[PDB]
Structure 1
Amino acid sequence: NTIIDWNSCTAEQQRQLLMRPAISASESITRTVNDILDNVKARGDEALREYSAKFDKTTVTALKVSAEEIAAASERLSDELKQAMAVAVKNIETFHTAQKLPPVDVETQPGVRCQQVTRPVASVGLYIPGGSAPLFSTVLMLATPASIAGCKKVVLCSPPPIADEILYAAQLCGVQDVFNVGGAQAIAALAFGTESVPKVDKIFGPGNAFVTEAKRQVSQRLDGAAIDMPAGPSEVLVIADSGATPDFVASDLLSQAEHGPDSQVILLTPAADMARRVAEAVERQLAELPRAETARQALNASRLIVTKDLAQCVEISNQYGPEHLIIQTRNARELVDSITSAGSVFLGDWSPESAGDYASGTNHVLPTYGYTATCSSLGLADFQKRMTVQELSKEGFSALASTIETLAAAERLTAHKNAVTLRVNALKEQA
């Protein structure tokens, strides 16, 4: 509970109110993940099978899940679920396909043709945390854009035994191979490759501390691979005016809170009345949540802030740059233009966070922990790259030659200048 009267706080107390958790990061895990990587790179599968004893009694046999196993899993899933996933995929597919960069083809000057084309990332590996109730929805979020971009190889790793939901999810999005491996060793297998797991160009998907560390390390190693983005605690910031519904606001704060004890939960409202009613609704709803220890633990760091007006809410939100920004105001749409920093925005009272997590079609893999400053939500662009192309006709080149020689000359790049002179002389002789 405890409401915060923003304008009664000192300037320092304020910045302190929104400060994100400090990064502990123990060397313990840095060295541990270091052993794991080196070991996986050198002794491939043999190393993997070994770790397949240490953590979780899996004693993995064949690293790759068979087509029969996937089929057996797909049969045990209800039609309701299967149909639910087809809806999500269809919408996610529609949104990402819409992100395709239209071809760039222009002549900056007559005869000087410059283009920007797209090429897909050759191969991508998808990591999915295991457990009893895995977040299989992330499979749809990673594998669908990978499919749309035209990635030649799309593979997925997850701690064995892999739940039926993940198997079916992978299959539905066309994942080629699913491997029984997890933790820091699954990341290494993807970055370095083994006798069974292929080396990929980019690794996608969040996970625990070890997985996060492993991704960080393989992203800084020449022998490793690139990653989708750095990690950080998830965040949600709700802006609510006097017209908002306390229960709706609370349900979104709680949705975020139930993700992990480290979740950042923030409410901004110009009405003390609203802040108080939201705190009450949070209390009531919390009491009905089953496994609600993390939600309560996350709420210990929450902030229910009362601002002087709506503009101040936007001002605070922009400084923070939240992963998820939910605008439950009466003219939500109009505020979008003034929002300069957020991962994903949800407008109105009928756009719950959960809608974006599962079926609106947007991607729920977003930048957080302040990275909204320069990084973007996962989209088509993260599974491809922009390649430029240029062709100068004899005319275009001749028209630019002098400019190029002058510049190359000012930078003291003789060979750069000579490449031009040689060509101009060749043309003079053929003219």
Structure 2
Amino acid sequence: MSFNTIIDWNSCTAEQQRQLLMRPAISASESITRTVNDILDNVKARGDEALREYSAKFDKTTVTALKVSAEEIAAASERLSDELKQAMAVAVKNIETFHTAQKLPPVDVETQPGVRCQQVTRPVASVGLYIPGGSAPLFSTVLMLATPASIAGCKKVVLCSPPPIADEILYAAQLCGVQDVFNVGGAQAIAALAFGTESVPKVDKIFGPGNAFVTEAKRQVSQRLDGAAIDMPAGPSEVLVIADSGATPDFVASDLLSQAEHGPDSQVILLTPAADMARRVAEAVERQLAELPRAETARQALNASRLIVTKDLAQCVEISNQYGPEHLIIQTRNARELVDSITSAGSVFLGDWSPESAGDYASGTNHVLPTYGYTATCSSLGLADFQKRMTVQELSKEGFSALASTIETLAAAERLTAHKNAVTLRVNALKEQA
């Protein structure tokens, strides 16, 4: 009943320790790349016609109106329970509070007298959100994406999801101010958003995860000048828990299983200085798994899980920093004190009462995070992903005069005489008047 068990880290060889922290590579798949390539070209060339043809071959009932009406949105909202609507409101309120707190303060400084430099921000003008479908869609991603778009001040916010779109997605969209929702999914939805169709607007940037085709479609459109930008590359999700002797096995196990149930390629890792904790967590994981309504997916993910025993907490921190987990959960007595030493992780959870579930749904932090090692250079999705920094400078006659010789010297040293001449012309015009 056990597919392996506990790994004593220091008993491993140097080679094994390095492979233990490596992530499963992606097979390219020339076939998916070509299918998506053809879907993208077809949607750009033939618009809604192309989308309806695709729909006709999948849906059984071919989509007609690509845009979801206000009436369909209101009927969907009426079918939802007050309990669910109230829970979404609490979530959106916390997400809004945290992301609003991310607004950049003004950057306005005179680097030297009369040389005023500023950094200002401007919203990405139009954004497209993609939400995977199905009977039980993860509608919470709508709150995670539409909320910061709204706070950033994006002028157009639209969303695509495979028809028929669940009531929960339609209500979440409405709740967050999403302007238009369209009955399209997969690589065709990514194409419709990146290129525009008669019904779907062309957006500047596309957000949201999806399957291999959606992921490949986002990859492709981000590489074409006639395409659109995307939020961040994709890959298998992950959770790494650091637990000491004072942790509760069932809490640890429940966090590993929350992540394992997401998909068969989820990576879940435990790092602990106590072999006893590792064994107890392994038993808890096995007992809790047995009770999951549909544990087939979690069971698969657990085959890549690693329950590692280390020498101490400092080594747990060294290993986690090398891995750079999407979610880092720290169930140790001194959890907060360890944060200063964490150098790579998407979102961190501290203590016994901060399950990953709390962040996935309502704490206020964003659950769209870098995975598959991308935490090395990418950030948690945040307000900054919906806007861009622009710089501004104004030199007075005095500021310019005081900096002119320095600029001339540098331009002369790079042998860029035109750059130098733009300065000389002004120095002469100023002497001429003074």
Report the TM range for the smaller structure's normalisation: over 0.9
Is contact 1:58–1:161 with CA below 8 Å preserved after alignment? no
TM-score, scaled to structure 1: 1.00
What is the 5 A alignment of 1:362-401? 362-401=365-404
Is contact 1:87–1:359 with CA below 8 Å preserved after alignment? yes
Give the CA deviation at 1:122. Answer: 0.5
Residue 301 of structure 1 corresponds to 304
Give the CA deviation at 1:23. Answer: 1.1
CA distance in 1, matches of 2:150, 2:61: 30
CA distance in 1, matches of 2:412, 2:27: 52
Give the CA deviation at 1:2. Answer: 1.3
After superposition, give the CA deviation of every residue in 1:223-267 in whole Å (9 maximum; x if it has no partner): 000000000000000000000000000000000000000000100
CA distance in 2, matches of 1:77, 1:105: 48
Give the CA deviation at 1:54. Answer: 1.6
After superposition, give the CA deviation of every residue in 1:358-408 in whole Å (9 maximum; x if it has no partner): 000000000010000000000000000000000000000000000011011
Give the CA deviation at 1:215. Answer: 0.1
Give the CA deviation at 1:57. Answer: 2.1
Instruction: Give yes or no for the alignment of 1:178 onto 2:181.
Output: yes
Question: How many aligned residue pairs are there?
Answer: 431
After superposition, give the CA deviation of every residue in 1:28-75 in whole Å (9 maximum; x if it has no partner): 100000000000000011000000112222411010000000000000
Is contact 1:37–1:188 with CA below 8 Å preserved after alignment? yes
Secondary structure of the equivalent of 1:338? coil
Secondary structure of the equivalent of 2:340? helix
CA distance in 2, matches of 1:247, 1:56: 42
Give the CA deviation at 1:19. Answer: 1.5
CA distance in 2, matches of 1:399, 1:13: 61
Q: CA RMSD in A?
A: 0.5
CA distance in 2, matches of 1:2, 1:324: 22
Secondary structure of the equivalent of 1:316? helix
Give the CA deviation at 1:186. Answer: 0.2
Is contact 1:112–1:396 with CA below 8 Å preserved after alignment? yes
Give the CA deviation at 1:318. Answer: 0.3
Picking from 199, 202, 227, the partner of 1:199 is: 202
Is contact 1:58–1:160 with CA below 8 Å preserved after alignment? no
CA distance in 1, matches of 2:313, 2:179: 49
What is the 5 A alignment of 1:31-430? 31-430=34-433
Amino-acid identity (%): 100
Secondary structure of the equivalent of 2:93? helix
CA distance in 1, matches of 2:308, 2:84: 39
CA distance in 2, matches of 1:310, 1:422: 64
Is contact 1:269–1:307 with CA below 8 Å preserved after alignment? yes
Give the CA deviation at 1:430. Answer: 0.8
Give the CA deviation at 1:22. Answer: 1.5
CA distance in 2, matches of 1:3, 1:31: 42
CA distance in 2, matches of 1:327, 1:260: 23
CA distance in 1, matches of 2:116, 2:331: 48
Secondary structure of the equivalent of 2:158? strand
Is contact 1:105–1:113 with CA below 8 Å preserved after alignment? yes
CA distance in 2, matches of 1:292, 1:100: 41
Secondary structure of the equivalent of 1:333? helix
CA distance in 2, matches of 1:393, 1:56: 64
> Which residues of structure 1 form unaligned runs of 5+?
none
Give the CA deviation at 1:18. Answer: 2.0
CA distance in 2, matches of 1:58, 1:340: 50
CA distance in 1, matches of 2:316, 2:204: 41
CA distance in 1, matches of 2:61, 2:152: 34
After superposition, give the CA deviation of every residue in 1:190-226 in whole Å (9 maximum; x if it has no partner): 0000000000000000000000000000000010000
CA distance in 2, matches of 1:2, 1:419: 70
CA distance in 2, matches of 1:22, 1:385: 32
Secondary structure of the equivalent of 2:150? helix
TM-score, scaled to structure 2: 0.99
Give the CA deviation at 1:15. Answer: 1.1
Give the CA deviation at 1:110. Answer: 0.5
Secondary structure of the equivalent of 2:38? helix
After superposition, give the CA deviation of every residue in 1:322-342 in whole Å (9 maximum; x if it has no partner): 000000000100000000000
